[PDB]
RNA sequence: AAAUUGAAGAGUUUGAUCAUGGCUCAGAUUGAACGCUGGCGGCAGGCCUAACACAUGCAAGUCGAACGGUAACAGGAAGAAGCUUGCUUCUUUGCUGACGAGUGGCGGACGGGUGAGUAAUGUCUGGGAAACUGCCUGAUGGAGGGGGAUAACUACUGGAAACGGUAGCUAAUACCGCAUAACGUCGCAAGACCAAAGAGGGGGACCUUCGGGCCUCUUGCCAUCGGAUGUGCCCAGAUGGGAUUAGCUAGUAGGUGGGGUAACGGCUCACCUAGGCGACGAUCCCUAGCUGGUCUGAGAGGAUGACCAGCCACACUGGAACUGAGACACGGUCCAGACUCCUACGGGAGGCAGCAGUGGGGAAUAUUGCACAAUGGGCGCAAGCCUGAUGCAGCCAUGCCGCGUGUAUGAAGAAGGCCUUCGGGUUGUAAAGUACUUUCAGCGGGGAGGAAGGGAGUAAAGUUAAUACCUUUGCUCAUUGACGUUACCCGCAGAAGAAGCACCGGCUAACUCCGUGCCAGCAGCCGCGGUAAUACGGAGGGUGCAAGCGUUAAUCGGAAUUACUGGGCGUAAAGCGCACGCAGGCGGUUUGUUAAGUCAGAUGUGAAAUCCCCGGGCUCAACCUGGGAACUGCAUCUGAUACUGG
């Protein structure tokens, strides 16, 4: 129910940095990001149509840690809701819980956020959430619990997150180790390399 | 007021009983062309005032025989 | 017969069958008698026989061995036959 | 019906029950079935390391 | 007779009983003339747990429909919560 | 307000192109099977074959508040013993609490199972009358007087057994007349005729022969009119394929009379008429349970009927009737048959398509489990009993969904593998290392909720001559869980116990070396293999899915490749050789009416579940659930008059 492999193979396979490691070290210094992974990795073919839609879908899946039937249910729910389909799919993948913990910076990366959530440490409205795929709602607090308030890796992750840029649809107050999901985000607040018509075409083949 | 139909008459060769060809106009369930289907009813009558070509208004009653359950209420267009 | 209730139901059913066949043959013979007098033509004896027949069919219809409509159509049947007679 | 035998080599004789599973072999005229290699009397290929589920061979250690 | 009773539609360990004006001789989950209300046994705080249309229920009790044990206790509970 | 937001192509005829045209793949789904692999949890599902046969246990009983009565119990008494002069007791007494057997009332027609039959006697939808309706409820009144039997038991008794037989007994709410009778049945009427049953609780007063008559309250019983529910019945439409099935039908179509049925009806007869059904598919053959739905589809449709729910049919095969409100009766009766079993050879018994399970068949589908704690049912005034329905547990990666196998740092870019233009690349921040966490499995502790009721006592009120009895309303008491070592919470110690399968020539994401040499083999199609095989086998690397992955089967899509939406006919398959013409289809133009088709509003209805839209809960999801539209229909009323029809 996860991918426990070498993460820079994913980062190097897409080519873009997936924000898969912390940021203490430059990830271009960490891996040989120029070539593709594997043996024949200095080859770059004229990438086909199944290839380009698969690469956009896999970039999103390996950014957010979401496996295939989970992603297909997110697509079915996204096309089921009102409004724009890609906007709704990015809204659901942003409303995952461990993405909210990564955006609030309580964990280093998204995988460390998944371990922090899954090891019984996050309080949504003062309630223990044991699950990384909790769906968060607007006007909702999210806090760390008291047995996890002393962990050094949380404040290390906090100094790394406030070294990084901040997400704008959240409120954070890290002296309490808490915050609130103020509003469900828009398409514009996210990144622009994540494309969306490729994903809706691949799951509407 | 009473749920009554009207149809022509095919024959009356047996006594106290006529057979009525109600041509009701139906939509076709797929192609949409309004074809016609004529359903025959064994219609009871007294003293045999009707013959071939009559246009009879009929209502349903208690079953007078095995296959005859409709009796008539008025009769128009008696001749040809 | 494997359930004790089924054994008891068989015994009660055969007792009631003997008794109801007795009652039914009483009613049948009393109706065939007035049919015989009705086809015999003799109106005074036939009407006396129908008066002999009406209380026993109406007692069987009261106790429910037959139906009230069955007794009513029997009485109406032979009243129509006596009227025709 | 006749039925093709897959794999690289086999052990099948007569008098031995096997399972056929359908699927037309293109180049044998008039044979439409394969035998389920691994099933019930026809054991798997010798020393095959890949595609082992299709030919019925346990995991190597 | 026709009774007002409770049919257990739910899952394991967590029932949910919907009341029905049904025949006596039918199944529990079987047919029913009219569906009136429900009673959630493990209904939580701050919410509504039980809902019975006492108009239709008293209409059927006038019409000759009897009562059940649990729905008798529930009708007493609704008219006490009044 | 919302109930939608919905549609992909590719390879392959050819030297090459365009077109027609098949063939195959890419997607979703499964009651699935098999191969490899296999940590947990939640909820669902689990003989599709042989409707094949069954060992063994259980699946329908209950009522002493109907009845005689005691087969065992436990309370109460009497007699007598060492007296253990107050007891261990042994006999009689149904006196009491109870209760095997037996009569009787209700229940076994519900609940459960299966889909063989049935192409319409069934089903779905809308109408209709000529009907019955135990239990439940509303109203109106009755509720007297008697009698004869027969089980249990007694004695004899046939029989191996199952089952009986005789002679006597005994009672009831069992049975039967009698008295009675309306607005009940027959008749237009006069008139005639028709019913029954008590039991229990408490007793003020008169009072019993000590069983009490009498009073009071509960619950029964009868007749009738009702109500609701259920069941029977009829009509109309829709409900597979085939015209290499065009004739069929003698109770057959109708009439009149009789009979019968709860009820109309050839339902059944006598007699008469000679009809009816049929190219809008009768008859005949083959297949099939149908529907709400489910899968797919953008939609119209196609396939299909697993779980769930409604209806129908059947209960070893073929029949028939009784009892009963209701069966032509799953665990009832009677007859015949095959099978299995017992026999004293005379005769008998049985029916898992109930739940488990077995044998067999099969590619394939579970425990001879716990409980009535909950819901519902049966009886009961109740307490309570029965409940293989149901609630749960066991199994199975069968599906859906959720989680885990760590996280961070980490270049000596370690070794080792593999490749190399012998620079090196790659495995690869991957491993080692150091730091941080303990979800789940394990260990120990706390523990909700599913439980509302029921049983005692008291208070108030209602009856009541009555502060008794009973019912309602509260009020204190101990209380009632199979699941259960429960859901969940808390503490422990350690990265420990937890990753595989398919593929890599194109379609199709993913390439190089080595072993072969038209051999071995792969294949879903095109094609590969004949000495440099990116297609076979192995390694390294990768890609895709992930506690699953594939191969097969089966449906739909793509298939506009059966085209109504949505095809084509000169040459690709396709215009009858040509004309006449009945039925059928279509019909110029003006007016008037009708309003059938059409449209529009309302009414009834489209069972609930599901699908969908908003919402609620299980920490999330699956799942459960509230409200809503939809339920593209059918019928009825009411309109409008352009088109089509008369
Ligand atoms: Mg999963
Ligand atoms: Mg959208
Ligand atoms: Mg017998
Ligand atoms: Mg083509
Ligand atoms: Mg060629
Ligand atoms: Mg296994
Ligand atoms: Mg059998
Ligand atoms: Mg046996
Ligand atoms: Mg007894
Ligand atoms: Mg009964
Ligand atoms: Mg069938
Ligand atoms: Mg009596
Ligand atoms: Mg009398
Ligand atoms: Mg007649
Ligand atoms: Mg008659
Ligand atoms: Mg299509
Ligand atoms: Mg039957
Ligand atoms: Mg039979
Ligand atoms: Mg009867
Ligand atoms: Mg009786
Ligand atoms: Mg039975
Ligand atoms: Mg049986
Ligand atoms: Mg079984
Ligand atoms: Mg076997
Ligand atoms: Mg076998
Ligand atoms: Mg076993
Ligand atoms: Mg119970
Ligand atoms: Mg029992
Ligand atoms: Mg599981
Ligand atoms: Mg090296
Ligand atoms: Mg634990
Ligand atoms: Mg509790
Ligand atoms: Mg409670
Ligand atoms: Mg492979
Ligand atoms: Mg490619
Ligand atoms: Mg292969
Ligand atoms: Mg060569
Ligand atoms: Mg070679
Ligand atoms: Mg291949
Ligand atoms: Mg098509
Ligand atoms: Mg196909
Ligand atoms: Mg064409
Ligand atoms: Mg030609
Ligand atoms: Mg041609
Ligand atoms: Mg020509
Ligand atoms: Mg012509
Ligand atoms: Mg015209
Ligand atoms: Mg009109
Ligand atoms: Mg519905
Ligand atoms: Mg929710
Ligand atoms: Mg006109």
UniProtKB/Swiss-Prot annotation, chain A:
Record family assignment: Belongs to the universal ribosomal protein uS4 family.
Superkingdom in the source lineage: Bacteria
Keyword field: Antibiotic resistance, Repressor, Ribonucleoprotein, Ribosomal protein, Ribosome biogenesis, RNA-binding, rRNA-binding, Transcription, Transcription antitermination, Transcription regulation, Transcription termination, Translation regulation
Subunit comment: Part of the 30S ribosomal subunit. Contacts protein S5. With proteins S3 and S5 encircles the mRNA as it enters the ribosome, which may play a role in mRNA helicase processivity. Some nascent polypeptide chains are able to cross-link to this protein in situ. The rRNA transcription and antitermination complex (rrnTAC) consists of RNAP, NusA, NusB, NusE (rpsJ), NusG, SubB, ribosomal protein S4, DNA and precursor rRNA; S4 is more flexible than other subunits.
Record bears the keyword Transcription regulation: yes
A biological process from GO: response to antibiotic
Gene Ontology MF terms in the entry: mRNA 5'-UTR binding; mRNA regulatory element binding translation repressor activity; rRNA binding; structural constituent of ribosome
GO cellular component: cytoplasm; cytosol; cytosolic small ribosomal subunit; small ribosomal subunit
Domain S4 RNA-binding, residue spans: 95-155
Top-level taxonomy: Bacteria, Pseudomonadati, Pseudomonadota, Gammaproteobacteria, Enterobacterales
Organism of provenance: Escherichia coli (strain K12)
NCBIfam families: PRK05327.1, rpsD_bact
Record protein name field: Small ribosomal subunit protein uS4
Curated annotation (Swiss-Prot), chain B:
A Gene Ontology cellular-component term: cytosolic small ribosomal subunit
Alphabetic keyword roster: Antibiotic resistance, Ribonucleoprotein, Ribosomal protein, RNA-binding, rRNA-binding
InterPro entries, sorted: NA-bd_OB-fold (IPR012340), Ribosomal_uS17 (IPR000266), Ribosomal_uS17_bact/chlr (IPR019984), Ribosomal_uS17_CS (IPR019979)
Function: One of the primary rRNA binding proteins, it binds specifically to the 5'-end of 16S ribosomal RNA. Also plays a role in translational accuracy; neamine-resistant ribosomes show reduced neamine-induced misreading in vitro.
Note: The strain missing both S17 and L29 grows very slowly and has a rather unstable temperature-sensitive phenotype.
HAMAP family referenced in this protein's UniProt entry, alphabetically: Ribosomal_uS17_B
Annotated family: Belongs to the universal ribosomal protein uS17 family.
Name this protein carries in UniProt: Small ribosomal subunit protein uS17
UniProt organism field: Escherichia coli (strain K12)
Gene designation per UniProt: rpsQ
UniProtKB/Swiss-Prot annotation, chain C:
Entries under InterPro entries matching the protein: Ribosomal_bS20, Ribosomal_bS20_sf
Region feature Disordered, mapped onto this chain: 1-25
UniProt keyword terms in alphabetical order: Ribonucleoprotein, Ribosomal protein, RNA-binding, rRNA-binding
Organism superkingdom: Bacteria
GO molecular function: ornithine decarboxylase inhibitor activity; small ribosomal subunit rRNA binding; structural constituent of ribosome
GO biological process, one term: ribosomal small subunit assembly
A GO CC term attached to the entry: small ribosomal subunit
UniProt key word Iron: no
Family (UniProt): Belongs to the bacterial ribosomal protein bS20 family.
Quaternary structure and partners: Part of the 30S ribosomal subunit.
Purpose of the protein: Binds directly to 16S ribosomal RNA.
Protein name (Swiss-Prot/TrEMBL): Small ribosomal subunit protein bS20
Naturally occurring in which organism (per UniProt): Escherichia coli (strain K12)
From Swiss-Prot, chain E:
InterPro entries: Ribosomal_bS16, Ribosomal_bS16_CS, Ribosomal_bS16_dom_sf
Superkingdom classification of source: Bacteria
Alphabetized UniProt keyword annotations: Endonuclease, Hydrolase, Nuclease, Ribonucleoprotein, Ribosomal protein
A Gene Ontology BP annotation from the UniProt entry: cytoplasmic translation
GO molecular function, one term: DNA endonuclease activity
One cellular component term from this protein's GO annotations in UniProt: small ribosomal subunit
Induction: Part of the rpsP-rimM-trmD-rplS operon.
Keyword set includes Hydrolase: yes
Pfam family, one: Ribosomal_S16
Quaternary data: Part of the 30S ribosomal subunit.
HAMAP family attached to this UniProt entry: Ribosomal_bS16
Family label: Belongs to the bacterial ribosomal protein bS16 family.
The protein's role, per its UniProt record: In addition to being a ribosomal protein, S16 also has a cation-dependent endonuclease activity.
Protein's UniProt name: Small ribosomal subunit protein bS16
Originating organism: Escherichia coli (strain K12)
Gene: rpsP
